[PDB]
Structure formats: C-alpha cells, structure tokens
Amino acid sequence: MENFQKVEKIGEGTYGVVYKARNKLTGEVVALKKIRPSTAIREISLLKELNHPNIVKLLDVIHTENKLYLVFEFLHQDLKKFMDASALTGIPLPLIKSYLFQLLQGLAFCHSHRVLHRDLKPQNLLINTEGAIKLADFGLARAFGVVVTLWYRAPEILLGCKYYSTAVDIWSLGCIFAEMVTRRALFPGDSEIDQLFRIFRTLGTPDEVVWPGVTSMPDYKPSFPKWARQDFSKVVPPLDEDGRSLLSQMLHYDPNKRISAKAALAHPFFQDVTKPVPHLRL
Numbered sequence: 392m393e394n395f396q397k398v399e400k401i402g403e404g405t406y407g408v409v410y411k412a413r414n415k416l417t418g419e420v421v422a423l424k425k426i427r428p429s430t431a432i433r434e435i436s437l438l439k440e441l442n443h444p445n446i447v448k449l450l451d452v453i454h455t456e457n458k459l460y461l462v463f464e465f466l467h468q469d470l471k472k473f474m475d476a477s478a479l480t481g482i483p484l485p486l487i488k489s490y491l492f493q494l495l496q497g498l499a500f501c502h503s504h505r506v507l508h509r510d511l512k513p514q515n516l517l518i519n520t521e522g523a524i525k526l527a528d529f530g531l532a533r534a535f536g537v538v539v540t541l542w543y544r545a546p547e548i549l550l551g552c553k554y555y556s557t558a559v560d561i562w563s564l565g566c567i568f569a570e571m572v573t574r575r576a577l578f579p580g581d582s583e584i585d586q587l588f589r590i591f592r593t594l595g596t597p598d599e600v601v602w603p604g605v606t607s608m609p610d611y612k613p614s615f616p617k618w619a620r621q622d623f624s625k626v627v628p629p630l631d632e633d634g635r636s637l638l639s640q641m642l643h644y645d646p647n648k649r650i651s652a653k654a655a656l657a658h659p660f661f662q663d664v665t666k667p668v669p670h671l672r673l
C-alpha cells in the first residue's frame with residue numbers, strides 16, 4: 392500500500408488479518424494489524440505510550456481512508472509455535488521460569504497503568520532469539536470489545552460477570568504456565584459451558600465458601616454438577632512444589648484471592664530465575 396509493503400500474511404488476529412510488512416520509508420519490518428469509534432482511536436492512541444521490555448511496542452495507530460491499522464514491532468516467533476516445536480522434549484524448566492517471570496513483569500507494568508489484556512493466549516505471547524518474551528495486544532479489548540479460543544478464559548468471564556479485573560490476566564497466564572510445563576492445554580474447552588465444566592472438574596465446582604458471590608453471578612446455575620477438587624500434584628506433575636504453589640495462587644476462583652502479578656514476582660519459585668537462550672528455528 393501507500394506506506395507499506397505486505398511481506399506475508401502472518402495470520403488471523405482477534406480483530407482482523409495481521410501481516411508481516413515493511414515500511415517503505417524506513418525499511419523496518421513490523422506486524423501490521425488491520426482492524427475489522429472515535430473513542431477507540433483515543434484509547435488505543437494512549438497505548439502507544441506504553442513502553443516496557445515485556446510488552447510488544449505499538450509503533451503507530453493509522454486511521455486513513457477510513458480504515459484502522461495498528462503497527463507493532465515485529466517479533467521472531469509466537470509461544471504457540473514454540474511450544475509445538477518443543478513438544479517432543481518440552482521447553483526446559485529454566486526457560487519456562489524465565490518466560491513466566493518476564494510475562495508477570497509485563498503484566499505488573501500494564502496493570503500498574505490500569506491496562507488489562509483480557510485475552511492472553513500463546514498466540515499473542517511473542518519471543519525473540521535473545522530469550523525475551525513479550526505480550527501483544529494489551530488494552531485492545533477495552534478499546535474495542537467483541538473460531539475464538541476459550542482455553543485461557545477466567546471463570547468469572549465464563550460466568551457472565553461484566554466487570555473485568557487484572558485477575559483475568561493472571562488466570563490466563565496461569566493456564567499458559569501449566570501448558571508449558573505439561574505440554575498440553577490445561578482446560579481445552581470447545582464451548583463456553585465445556586470450558587467452564589472442564590475447570591470445575593479439575594479445581595472443583597466453586598461454591599460460596601471458596602468464592603463468595605459466585606452463586607449470584609449472571610450465568611451461574613444451581614444445577615451445575617458438583618465435582619470435587621482434584622489434587623494439584625496430578626494437574627501439572629513435573630512441576631515442583633514452588634511452581635505448584637504459585638500456579639494454585641494464579642488459579643484461585645475468586646478474582647480477589649488470585650495473586651497479583653506484582654506479588655507473584657516475589658514468589659519463591661523465582662528465587663533462582665535466569666534468562667536462558669531459546670533454540671528458535673526461524
């Protein structure tokens with residue numbers, strides 16, 4: 392187009408097609424996302440001012456010929472592909488730990504700036520050859536808002552709560568952490584109810600004891616089956632107790648009891664964190 396050269400279609404994003412493109416003027420390659428409101432323009436534009444090592448930079452918001460494009464710094468590979476590529480032997484624990492640590496740093500930053508992601512998934516976690524991992528698309532959900540993956544959706548969202556909190560991002564990261572460790576999605580639901588019951592079958596059907604206010608949620612039904620909680624040691628076996636304790640805190644039903652990114656960074660699991668180099672096949 393006028394100021395870009397579409398190198399390739401890197402895929403279908405939440406709001407539209409995403410292409411690997413090259414800016415004709417600078418020659419820089421970026422991830423150009425076509426969006427499929429004047430308030431959205433204002434909000435999104437504010438996001439350009441979010442700089443952190445673990446957040447994919449939003450270089451530009453382009454509103455021309457009545458189309459909306461978001462220009463992002465280009466990263467080497469997404470975690471989804473990396474996990475698939477590492478499925479035979481699994482991502483080494485030190486690297487899993489480094490990634491979780493960095494992602495929490497990115498979340499702690501966004502959240503301290505009152506920005507939520509709401510749709511964290513391996514597809515929007517990007518890595519580079521130097522061992523960094525970054526979160527892409529923070530704050531787009533709020534600015535915009537509505538086959539979609541439900542695997543990383545927090546239970547409060549599934550139960551129809553209309554007010555999101557920073558806790559939904561911790562839940563999603565918890566699901567991703569488990570998946571890196573076991574090499575299998577933690578809650579692979581095929582529908583909203585299947586997603587919810589898969590969570591219930593593992594963590595136990597929530598009640599007013601563990602989640603005060605749950606029985607009054609919009610889509611909660613007294614007729615939900617009552618499953619008992621499974622022992623955590625069976626959920627992510629290869630993980631040591633520090634990792635399991637941290638994961639359990641990231642998967643608390645009550646958003647208010649769920650650990651914050653900031654507090655998670657101080658968890659004992661990270662006492663020996665390092666920054667390994669991943670073996671990336673580009």
Ligand SMILES: COc1cccc(C(=O)c2sc(Nc3ccccc3)nc2N)c1
Nearest residue numbers: 402403404409422464465466467515527
């Ligand atoms: C469907 O497309 C998506 C979905 C969610 C996030 C992004 C995104 O921001 C990206 S992808 C990317 N490089 C990349 C290089 C090789 C393989 C896959 C992605 N770099 C950025 N910045 C793209």
